Each structure stands twice: as C-alpha cells, then as structure tokens.
Amino acid sequence: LKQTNEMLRGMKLLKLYAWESIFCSRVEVTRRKEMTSLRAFAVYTSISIFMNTAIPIAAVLITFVGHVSFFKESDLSPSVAFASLSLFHILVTPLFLLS
Amino acid sequence: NKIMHLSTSNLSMGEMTAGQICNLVAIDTNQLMWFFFLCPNLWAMPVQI
Amino acid sequence: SRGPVAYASQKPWLLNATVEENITFESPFNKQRYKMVIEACSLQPDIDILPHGDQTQIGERGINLSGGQRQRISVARALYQQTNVVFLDDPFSALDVHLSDHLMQAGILELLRDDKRTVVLVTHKLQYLPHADWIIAMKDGTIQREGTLKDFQRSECQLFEHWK
Amino acid sequence: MLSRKGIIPEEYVLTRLAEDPTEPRYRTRERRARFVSKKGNCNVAHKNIREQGRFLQDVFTTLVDLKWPHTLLIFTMSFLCSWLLFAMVWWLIAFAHGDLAPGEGTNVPCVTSIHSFSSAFLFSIEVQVTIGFGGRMVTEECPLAILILIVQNIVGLMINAIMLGCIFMKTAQAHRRAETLIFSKHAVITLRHGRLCFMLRVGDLRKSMIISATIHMQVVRKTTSPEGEVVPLHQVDIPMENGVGGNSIFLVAPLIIYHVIDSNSPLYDLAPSDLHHHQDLEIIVILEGVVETTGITTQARTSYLADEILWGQRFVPIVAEEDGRYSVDYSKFGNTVKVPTPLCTARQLDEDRSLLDALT
Amino acid sequence: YALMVSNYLNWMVRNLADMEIQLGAVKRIHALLKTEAESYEGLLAPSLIPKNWPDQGKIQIQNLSVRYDSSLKPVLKHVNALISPGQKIGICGRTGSGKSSFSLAFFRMVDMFEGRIIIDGIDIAKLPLHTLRSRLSIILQDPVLFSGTIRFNLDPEKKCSDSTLWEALEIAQLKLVVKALPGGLDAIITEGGENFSQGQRQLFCLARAFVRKTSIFIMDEATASIDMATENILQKVVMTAFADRTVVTIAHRVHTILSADLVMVLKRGAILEFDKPETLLSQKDSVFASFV
Ligand SMILES: Nc1ncnc2c1ncn2[C@@H]1O[C@H](COP(=O)(O)OP(=O)(O)OP(=O)(O)O)[C@@H](O)[C@H]1O
Ligand SMILES: O=S(=O)(Nc1cc(CC2CCCCC2)n[nH]1)c1ccccc1Cn1ccnc1
Numbered sequence A: 001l002k003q004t005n006e007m008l009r010g011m012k013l014l015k016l017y018a019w020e021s022i023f024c025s026r027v028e029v030t031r032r033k034e035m036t037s038l039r040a041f042a043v044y045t046s047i048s049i050f051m052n053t054a055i056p057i058a059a060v061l062i063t064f065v066g067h068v069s070f071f072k073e074s075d076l077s078p079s080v081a082f083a084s085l086s087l088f089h090i091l092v093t094p095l096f097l098l099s
Numbered sequence B: 001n002k003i004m005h006l007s008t009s010n011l012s013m014g015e016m017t018a019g020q021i022c023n024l025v026a027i028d029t030n031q032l033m034w035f036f037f038l039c040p041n042l043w044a045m046p047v048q049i
Numbered sequence C: 001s002r003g004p005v006a007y008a009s010q011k012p013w014l015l016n017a018t019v020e021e022n023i024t025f026e027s028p029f030n031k032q033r034y035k036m037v038i039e040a041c042s043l044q045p046d047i048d049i050l051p052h053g054d055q056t057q058i059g060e061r062g063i064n065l066s067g068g069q070r071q072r073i074s075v076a077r078a079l080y081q082q083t084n085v086v087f088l089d090d091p092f093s094a095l096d097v098h099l100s101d102h103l104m105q106a107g108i109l110e111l112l113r114d115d116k117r118t119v120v121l122v123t124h125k126l127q128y129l130p131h132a133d134w135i136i137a138m139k140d141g142t143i144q145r146e147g148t149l150k151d152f153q154r155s156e157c158q159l160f161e162h163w164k
Numbered sequence D: 001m002l003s004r005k006g007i008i009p010e011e012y013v014l015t016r017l018a019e020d021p022t023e024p025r026y027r028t029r030e031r032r033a034r035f036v037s038k039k040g041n042c043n044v045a046h047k048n049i050r051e052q053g054r055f056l057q058d059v060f061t062t063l064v065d066l067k068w069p070h071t072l073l074i075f076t077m078s079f080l081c082s083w084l085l086f087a088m089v090w091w092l093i094a095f096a097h098g099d100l101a102p103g104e105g106t107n108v109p110c111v112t113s114i115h116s117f118s119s120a121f122l123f124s125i126e127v128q129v130t131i132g133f134g135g136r137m138v139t140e141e142c143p144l145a146i147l148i149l150i151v152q153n154i155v156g157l158m159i160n161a162i163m164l165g166c167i168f169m170k171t172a173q174a175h176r177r178a179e180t181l182i183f184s185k186h187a188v189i190t191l192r193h194g195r196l197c198f199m200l201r202v203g204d205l206r207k208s209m210i211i212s213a214t215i216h217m218q219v220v221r222k223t224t225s226p227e228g229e230v231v232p233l234h235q236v237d238i239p240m241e242n243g244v245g246g247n248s249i250f251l252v253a254p255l256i257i258y259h260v261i262d263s264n265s266p267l268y269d270l271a272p273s274d275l276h277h278h279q280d281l282e283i284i285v286i287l288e289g290v291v292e293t294t295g296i297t298t299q300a301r302t303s304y305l306a307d308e309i310l311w312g313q314r315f316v317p318i319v320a321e322e323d324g325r326y327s328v329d330y331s332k333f334g335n336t337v338k339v340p341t342p343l344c345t346a347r348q349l350d351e352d353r354s355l356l357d358a359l360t
Numbered sequence E: 001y002a003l004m005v006s007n008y009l010n011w012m013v014r015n016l017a018d019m020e021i022q023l024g025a026v027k028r029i030h031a032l033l034k035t036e037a038e039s040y041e042g043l044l045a046p047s048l049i050p051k052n053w054p055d056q057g058k059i060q061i062q063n064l065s066v067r068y069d070s071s072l073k074p075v076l077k078h079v080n081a082l083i084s085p086g087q088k089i090g091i092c093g094r095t096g097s098g099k100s101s102f103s104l105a106f107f108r109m110v111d112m113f114e115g116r117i118i119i120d121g122i123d124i125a126k127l128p129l130h131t132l133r134s135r136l137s138i139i140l141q142d143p144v145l146f147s148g149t150i151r152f153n154l155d156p157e158k159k160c161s162d163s164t165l166w167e168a169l170e171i172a173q174l175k176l177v178v179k180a181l182p183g184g185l186d187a188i189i190t191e192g193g194e195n196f197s198q199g200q201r202q203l204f205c206l207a208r209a210f211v212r213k214t215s216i217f218i219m220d221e222a223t224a225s226i227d228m229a230t231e232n233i234l235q236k237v238v239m240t241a242f243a244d245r246t247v248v249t250i251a252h253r254v255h256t257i258l259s260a261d262l263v264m265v266l267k268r269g270a271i272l273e274f275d276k277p278e279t280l281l282s283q284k285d286s287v288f289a290s291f292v
C-alpha cells in the first residue's frame, strides 16, 4: 500500500515519463510477495474451519462406536442418544469461544 | 486527561510518539472492551461444561 | 497563573479541518479582523489557488501545503487570537519572502501599537533586527542582555557588523 | 454457526481521508411547519407532560371525548361485566344455600328455579334490566340475597344514570357542525378606497344560523425585541377594521373579511417579494359563535401561509339577485381575479401618498 | 434440530448483514472497474511509417485548438504558429493558459484537439503514446522523485547499464552527493528525496534527457529556485540546444525567456503576441513592464 500510494502520488509524472509499466512490475512483485502470505493465511484458516466443523462429528462417532462395541451395556435408547446429541450441540458453542 | 497533564520533554516525545499513542488508544482500549464483553464467558463456560 | 499566551513554533502545527476554522481556533469570527489578518498575511492568492479556498481540508489527512503556507496559517491564527502576549519561533526563517515578511511586520507593529500589548518575535530577520523595539540576546544557554537597541552598538561585537 | 471478532490491528493504516458523503441533501425543501391546518386541528405537539392522574380523574370527560364506537364498546363491556359479576354472586349464594344441589324440596330455596349458572345469569339479567320473569323468584328466608338484590338495583340505577348522562353529553357535541364552515382556499390582498387591505372570504354551508358570531385575527411569527427577547411564535391580535370596531358579524352569505393595513398594523412592512413559501409568516383566523340549535359555542380555525396569499387579486362576486330572492353560487367561493396594484409595501405606499400630498 | 433453529437464524442474519456490508465495497470496486478509457494505440502503422525519434523538430501548427470539458470553452483558438526546427525557442506568457495548452498538446494529453500537428513531418495522434512520451523529456513545476535505486529510477524503462549515465549524473550536479552515496549509480533513494537538494528534479530530468537522447526538450515553470539553480538550468538549456538542437521553455520569467531564439505569449484563450526574434519582446515595453 505504501509503494502504490507513492506511485499514485506522482501518477502524472509516472504517466508522462512512460515508467508506468516499470513501476507496475515492482507492484506485481510485491503483490505476489503478499499473496504468498495470504495463501498461507488461507490455508491456516481452512485448517481451523475444518477442525471446528469436524470435531463434534468425530466425537459423536467415537462415543457411539465405543458404547456399541467396547461397552454394549445398553440398546442405544433414543432418550439417551438424542439427549447426548443435544448436549454436544449445546457444548459446541462454548468450546470454540474459550480460546 | 493524562495527555493534558503530560510533559513535553523530548526524552518522552521521541520515545512515545503521537502515532504510537494513537495506536495504543485505538487497539488497547478496544481489546480491553472486548475482554470486558467476554468476561462473563470465562466465569460461566467452565461451570456449564 | 498564566493567561492565554499566543505561541508559534518552528515546526508548524495544523488542524485537519477547513482553513478558516484552523485560523480561528475555536474563536468568534469577526469579518473585519479576519480580512485585516488575511491582507497582512497575503494569503488571498493562496486561497484563490485552493479549490474551496478557506474551506479546504488543510493539514494532515487532507490537503497538504508547503512549509511557507503552513507558517502563514500559523502566524495568521496567532495574530487573530488577539492576545496581550504573542510568541513567535522563527516565523521568517521558514518563509523568507521579503514583501510578505515586511507586510506582516508592519501589520503586527500597527496592531500591537493599537493594543499596547507585548509581542515577542524570536527570529533572525536582519532586515528589522535594529529598531526602536527592545532586544534580547541569547547565547550559550543564557541571556546576554535584554534592553535598548543601543546596547548592541555599545558592545564591542556588533553582531559581526550586523551582516552588512 | 459463529462469526468473527472486531480485531483491528491497524485499521489498514492508510484507510483515511475518504470523505465524499454523497448525502441526498433533500431535507432543505422537505416541508414547512403549520401552526394549524386548513380544517382546524392545531398541529402542535406537546412534550414533557408531567401528569398527576388528572387525565384519568375526568372519567366522564374522557368518556364524552371518546368516539361513538369506543363509547358503545365501553357501554357493552361495563354492562356485561356487571351482569357477569352479579350472576356469579347469585350462583355463589345458591351454592352456599345448597338449593343448587339437586335434592328434595324439603327446604325453601333461597332463589326459585335455580338449576345452573345459565339460570343464575338469566335471573341476574332479569333483575338488572328489570325484566322479572317471576319463575326465578326471591324467597323471604334469604336476607343476604335480599341485600345483594338491593345493592344490584342501586348499582344498575347508577350505571344507567351515568350512561344516560354520557350519551346526552356526547349528543350535545356539535364539532361536526362547526366543521361545516367554509373559508377561502387562498387569501388575497388589494387596495380598497386607496388603502391596502388583507381580504378573506368565509362562508357557511348549513342553513342553520350561528348566533354570536365572533372572528379573531392574529399573526404568528418569530419576533425579536430590541432588548434581545426571542419569541419563537409571537401572536399579535389583528383588528377586523369594522365600522364600530367589534368582532361581531352577521354571516348569511359568504362575506369578505378585510383588515386595513395601517402603520400600527404589523403588516405595514410587507412586500409581495417576501411572500414566498419559506417565509416566517402565518395568518390565523379564529371564528367563535353559538349554534341556534344546540346553544353550544363553536370554533373555526384556519391558516394562511405567505405562499397562500394572492397579492394583487380580488374575490369575484358570489351573490346574484333572483326574481324573488338572492342566490349564492358556492362554486365561486375560491375564484379570484387580478387587481392592478402597486408592488410597493404599505410603508412605501404611505410614504408615496405623503410625498404626493407634500408636493401638492 | 428445533433447538438449533434460533441460533441458526441469528447467525444467518448476522452473516447476511456482514456479507451485504462487504458486498457494498465489492460493488463500489466493480463500478470503479467500469471506467474504461485512455486507449494507448495509434491509427496508423508504427513499424516504419513514423520517424524512429523526432530530431529535426519541424512541427507546423495548423489551426490547433485544445479543450478539456468535452471540446467546450477551449484555451486555444486556431493556434497556428511556425516553430523553429533545429533551434531552442522559449515562449513565455503572463497567463498560464498558454503554457498549459502547450504542455497538453505536446503529449496529446488534451481531451479535445481541434487542429492538426505534424510531429517531425508525421502525425502525432497516429504514433504510440508510450514512445512519444519516452522520446520527449519534460520537467515538472515541483520536484518529484520516486523511492528506489537511481539506476532503476533514472532509466527504469530503458534499463541502460552504461556508466555514461552515471558520469553524466555526477557531472551535471550533485557530484559530492553522488560520491558520498555508497550505491552511486545504483544508490537507493531516501523516501523519494525527503532530505535532498531542490535540484534533484532538474538533475533527474537532465539524466533522462542524456539517456533517452530526446532531441526535443519541454520546460515548465519554476516554483522556487536560487540564482545558482537558475544559472545551472540556463546552462543545461544551452547544452541541450547545442547537442539535442531543440528546446522549448515555458515560464513567466522574461529574463530567463530572453535567452531564446523566439518568444511568444498566449492569454485570454488565444495567442496574445508572437515575437520571432528575442529583441522584439523588449521592443514591446508592455510585456517587459508587466514582467518587471
Ligand atoms: N361549492 C362548494 N361546496 C362545498 N364546499 C366548497 C364549495 N366551494 C368550495 N368549498 C370548500 O372550500 C375549501 C377550499 O377548497 P376548494 O378548492 O375545493 O374550494 P374553493 O377554493 O372555494 O373553490 P371554488 O373555485 O369552487 O370556489 C374546501 O374545504 C372546499 O370543500
Ligand atoms: O452475537 S453477539 O452479541 N455479537 C456482537 C458483537 C458486537 C459489537 C458491538 C460492540 C463494539 C462496537 C461495535 C458493536 N455486538 N454484538 C455475542 C455476544 C457475546 C458473546 C458472543 C457473541 C457472538 N459474537 C462474537 C463476535 N461476533 C459475534
């Protein structure tokens, strides 16, 4: 932004000196340099969003598989299953805001 | 009020600049306000969990 | 106990607002005084160059002016404050336009003679360095003498012949 | 789901000096405030009203001020509530006496023919509206029922009296009749007998005559005294330029109300140039008088803004003589014709007259 | 699923509001993208039909008029003046309208051009604008410099690596500054000349003229310059007229403009007075009295 503001401040002189493309080359180089960091930021936030979206489903799957196989102490009553689902849905919000 | 009652010595003017103090006011106050907003969460969320 | 002492600085300070508001500086607007001040400062040609004139967003975050123009605005505001004491800090060092400096000097002399108020002009203006006004010499962090203009002539060193 | 926070590291740093509000700026010519409307209904808003229950103290006045549908609804609700309360009281009395129980008639029932809440309600209706079928009679061994009957009769009589009084007071109102008065849509100013005057036409539609007619003229404007007083809406009485000075008039046909603009009149320094829309000028005419039918004073309120004044115009004649009587063409109430008059003010007109007199 | 409905709706509304807020700026950007103009091209073959670089400077104005506001209220009215090829001619006018019109017409920057100009015997509107601006040096009213290496700042487009450019830069002015700068030819600028002499713009223009070998030179008004600066500018103009054989000076200083083959003035939207010799301006005492 500082570089492009410097370019635009003397925009008349740059246009009359036919150096617009010469400075635009450096503008593009700086744009690619910032775009690398922007891509890294996008990757990091994609990972964060994926983890946020996939954590509750994975936890529910693990809980159900463990109860069915390792314990097998109940017939998976709906009164327990849907209550656990509602509790997980409620607890999702505080978990992702505590950080 | 502190700015009004602040010395104008160069030892302080060249240390904490006008831009620096403006950024301080813009950022620190806002983040403290957000912390005040989120203060009930730190008291409630662990208990609820 | 200190009153509203008018002050000027070597580094000009401006308000990010209209030129007229910056000059007034939260003071009542008098058309006669404003016209006299702008005529003394010769700021009318500068206002003509500006698109909105005195309504242009002078200062930072807006229209940026030269050091001489900023000094003109600062001295105009200081004069328009109309205080019993006025301080300056090199008003002519930044802008050395001889005609404008002489006009401002004449206007300040007339206004202060009418108001019978104290005015301090800290500058190296050799054009009006010798005058009937009181003078004070500062060197090596001390005041050499603050009295009549004939004291400098009485001293052996006459300011290196006043750069004659 | 969720969202993000207001984390601003530097607010883009360079994000400043945008300006260009591009505001519509359409509020300059939005509208002009009017003290009163063309049909009365003073458009004045009250604020910071500190009431101490006096609004609800005048219950009868509020009922009278209530419209006919609201009055009917209040009447019906009050009567239904009274009937239901009395029916519930009778039902409770019957239950306490035990006559409600479907047992042998060994004991004399407190009230005869009482079988259910429907029967109790029918008995209450008969008692309060004085129907008296007689199948549900009152025994002589129920003193509490006798006292309740007495109280119910007293309450019913009082309610009937109050409702009749409210109905009579509402019927005595004649504001709708007061609305039948007709005033000129736009007023005119023209010279009369060499003197400038502000003319206005007022007429009535209904053939019923209004007695004790009295018209008051005032000017509402912001006036500042040389002492520095600031009056937002200063009201100054305006004489009618009557032959005797009184405001009493005899209005049968639409008459022309004219005020001679003298030196003492506030209109002495007015010009047609300053007669535009956004002008600090408003003429208020208040007409008072009693109706020959109801005997109740009625008030008519009209306003004339500066843009509503027709400088240099004359009202057309409205009354035409017939073979046996006179006729009034009410379709000509608002028709005016131009009158050639000088454009100078009243002050300039008087100055010119004085100069001509001095020269002659 | 019913319990989540309230929070789902709240988040949906909040995100919709945020999306609309951001889409406002998106629409503003898109509207800004609709401003298509400034087509850099030529209505002719630029391979060999035009001259490689204007050197003779034989340009004849044939009733040329220039206007900005959609060809309305032009600052010139059928301007037809015979320039002097192979020599430096400096036209000075009391009003800036003539200088502005000349500057606009030199690079064809005027919105409207009611006339014809034969640039070195060829049309000006039928030539590449980039090449025309590259082969024509011009100075600015105020000193304007970029922030970067002098080698990449003096001739970024040319990208000439010859040491002759550095020699000319060190010889024209600021020899001590060039010597003190560790980079020298490739020394990086400091915030676009934040702390530099006011002659940096003139030195950069002289270096650009030396590098591009622009025969035609364009000069503008000087806001403020010392006597030494004016003398150096005059010496540079003389050197350009000796080597490039063409120079055009536009200013309001009669004493500076007198050092030219011809002098002309334009005011009130038209040509005021044209003086083929330098002494003709002094012959008409009115302009001399107005100047001083
Ligand atoms: N013949 C009429 N009968 C009833 N009301 C009338 C009549 N003429 C005018 N009015 C009333 O005069 C008021 C002014 O509005 P309107 O323009 O209709 O009348 P006007 O200026 O008197 O018109 P006209 O040209 O008919 O005299 C209105 O309240 C209108 O109802
Ligand atoms: O849903 S909230 O009330 N959100 C909200 C933000 C503001 C800012 C105002 C105050 C600062 C200045 C702008 C307006 N007001 N309200 C909410 C409340 C409490 C906890 C979590 C949330 C959800 N949350 C957090 C961040 N983003 C959404």
Ligand SMILES: [K+]
Pocket (backbone or CB within 6 Å): D129, D130, D131, D132, D133
């Ligand atoms: K009865």
Ligand SMILES: [K+]
Pocket (backbone or CB within 6 Å): D132, D133, D134, D135
């Ligand atoms: K009966």
